[PDB]
Amino acid sequence: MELIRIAMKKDLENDNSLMNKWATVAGLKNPNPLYDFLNHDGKTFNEFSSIVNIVKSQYPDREYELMKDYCLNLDVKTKAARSALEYADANMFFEIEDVLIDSMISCSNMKSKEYGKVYKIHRELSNSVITEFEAVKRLGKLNIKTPEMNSFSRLLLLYHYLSTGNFSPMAQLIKQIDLSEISENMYIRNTYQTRVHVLMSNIKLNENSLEECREYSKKALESTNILRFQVFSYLTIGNSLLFSNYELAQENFLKGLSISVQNENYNMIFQQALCFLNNVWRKENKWINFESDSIMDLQEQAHCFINFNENSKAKEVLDKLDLLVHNDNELAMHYYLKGRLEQNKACFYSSIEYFKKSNDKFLIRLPLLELQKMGENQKLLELLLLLEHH
Amino acid sequence: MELIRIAMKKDLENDNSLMNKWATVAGLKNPNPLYDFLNHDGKTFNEFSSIVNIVKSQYPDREYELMKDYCLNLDVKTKAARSALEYADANMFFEIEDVLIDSMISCSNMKSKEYGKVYKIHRELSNSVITEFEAVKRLGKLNIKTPEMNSFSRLLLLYHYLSTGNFSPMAQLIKQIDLSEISENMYIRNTYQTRVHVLMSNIKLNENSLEECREYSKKALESTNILRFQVFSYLTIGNSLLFSNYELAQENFLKGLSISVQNENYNMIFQQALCFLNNVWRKENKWINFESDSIMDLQEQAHCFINFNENSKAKEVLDKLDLLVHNDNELAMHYYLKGRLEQNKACFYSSIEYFKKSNDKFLIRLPLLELQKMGENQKLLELLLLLEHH
């Protein structure tokens, strides 16, 4: 048996009311599939949310342990296995996910093989094994048939656009996704819906449409019980308040921290959001990572040094940054930091240029402010706001 | 007998070598179609340019008179009649065109009927009898069959975009014209190629792609004997040199003037282009119309006064302009004039705003130059150069 089933039987001996509890949690509408699940090997529910909700309601502290065991004992040709692939990916359980992909690609079920091949494209692109052009080419050559994978083929590009600061294509591409065409696997329809909520929220953020940003993140939170999606929802809500409400921004970062501090990756992501928050507000900053050579962390070192008039220490950090490769959104911030250090309007104009190229209407408020303080003409600033890059 | 045949026979006695002279002017190998043309009623040359060329060679002072008599006597089911329709429309011989249109729409030849109907839409659209939307809708319901009218359906729309200064959709639209599909009527193939050359030239002008602009206009000039297209080729060539070559720009405007001596509207056009030329180069301007309340004429008054430090007269003229309603491009020039009169950078940014609104990448060089002269940052200027309105 599976660890989850061993543990479900043991606690069934000591408590029988669990059967009605487990059946209502899994939405079964009568407990026959449960009994079916436990008594015979290989029996799967028809919707994956039946185990996940049960593993959440009753063994929440060992979700990973139990699902890593169950998922990797699942026949990779089944619908539950195809579901476990999305479960693993959405939770960023790459140990579960990368094993399923290998088994599904070499397997004899074509639907599983399609899921596997496109999730593999997502994994290689998000680890910079292939370029965006190669990912697109490979997806075309796949001749994708399921509505699930036609949806995810667009999700993986949207995640790549986000991470590479290339925001202009995202809105048109996200609008091509039609989740209603997914009708056989509700778990995948339901998690993909949460994905689209988080992504729309981020698209709104970068459009400087902050109220609508917060609505989509609120919809995302209400629509999910997956920790990864709660994390990025509180992060995006917090970030929408960066320039307006310091304490409410901090409160969302600390709320996201309260459910995720144990995880090293999530711990770092809220540390960085808090670090940028305190730099924008020019406060003392206990969140800087002085032991890092990532662009984000070095930029925050320089931003803080600049806020406190430590110009040579700032220049020293920016000398390091000059020798690192930047994407367009990172380079925009780089020139903004330079413009503040040198009090040089041309560097602020180069920052705007790259914020326009990345199509970031949110962070561009930083160089615009500095040009305002230096007495820039108001019609000129209005002009720069209404012109785009294309 | 039509007048042209009467006159041709009459002159054939005096100079019997005219038969051979006309044979080569009409592009015939042997003179039997010419012999056919004079002696037998109702028969046509295979290509309409044969008789157009003869009329221009030997009776150029009577072109309208002779061609109106000849065209309005054609059987409208014939290729000569469909050719005559385009000949009338290209020359703006509206009295011939309108009669051809009505007779064609009612005849039993579905090809002539289709020609009549889409030229009809072109005339109604170009006189604002109908909106663009109604014109697209009407062309849609025609389900256009011939390659000629598929081409012309696009040309009439480009003329509308041109008439309204809406340059943005023009490059996309003109790229869809494929004149190589026009194989049966070479007269229409050739005149449409002139139409496309001239439209391409004006397109390139507005893009500030000036060497290509002049190439397409020289291609237009070499391809045609139609006054309208010669006039606008010389105008566009001269305009393309406004910022580079005073003497060659003047030479092209004066050549245009020479061929439109007895066309009041064309004459005024070259007068206005020379007036603008002399204000761009800040020379004495003997082309100014001081008895005019059109925007363009008044702008040139103010431009000349500003050039010659006559700022009170200049303010008087701009006072007059303030009480007149300006469109987008006109407003761009207005702010340029105000910015130079008041020496104020802000009115130059408004000038740029409206040049960007009209997708005029040529005339925008005027405020950009003044901004540079007032010490505007070089990276700002590039930014204003690169960014687009949408």
Residue numbers in the entry:
A (entry chain A), B (entry chain B): 1 to 390
Paper text:
Recently, in Bacillus phages, a peptide communication system named the arbitrium system was identified that plays an essential role in lysis–lysogeny decisions during infection of Bacillus host cells. This system requires the arbitrium hexapeptide to bind to its cellular receptor AimR to regulate transcription of the lysogeny negative regulator gene aimX. AimR is composed of two domains, a N-terminal domain that is responsible for DNA binding and a C-terminal domain that specifically recognizes the arbitrium peptide. The overall structure of AimR is similar to that of RRNPP family proteins.
In our previous reported structures of apo- and peptide-bound AimR, we were unable to trace the N-terminal DBD structure due to the poor electronic densities. In this study, we reoptimized the crystals and collected new datasets for AimR with or without the peptide. Finally, we traced the density of the DBD for AimR with or without the peptide. Here, we updated the apo- and peptide-bound form structures containing the DBD, although there were only subtle differences between them. In the apo- and peptide-bound form, the AimR dimer exhibits an inverted trapezoid-like fold. The last C-terminal capping helices from two AimR molecules undergo dimerization via a network of van der Waals interactions. The distance between the two aspartic acid residues in the inner cavity, D15 of AimRA and D15 of AimRB, is approximately 125 Å in apo- or peptide-bound AimR. The low- and high-FRET efficiencies are centered at 30% and 60%, with respective populations of ~43% and ~57%. Hence, in solution, AimR alone exists in two dynamic conformational states that correspond to the open and closed conformations according to the low- and high-FRET efficiencies. In the absence of the arbitrium peptide, dimeric AimR exhibits the dynamic open and closed conformations equally, which favor peptide and DNA binding, respectively.
